[PDB]
Amino acid sequence: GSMADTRRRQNHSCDPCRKGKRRCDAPENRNEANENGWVSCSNCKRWNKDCTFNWLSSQRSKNSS
């Protein structure tokens, strides 16, 4: 798990959904989505959770630090 492959990103769903096995609108560019008009996936806006890519931040490095 290094030369062949290191990172295994598949689900793009934000922290709360990916954990709860929910797929949301939140793309890989959820931040860039905020700039476009987006802000939080329907899940977060529905349950009032926390749209974050912390999962992304805990991968190869603190992507969002």
Ligand SMILES: [Zn+2]
């Ligand atoms: Zn979500």
Ligand SMILES: [Zn+2]
């Ligand atoms: Zn969310």
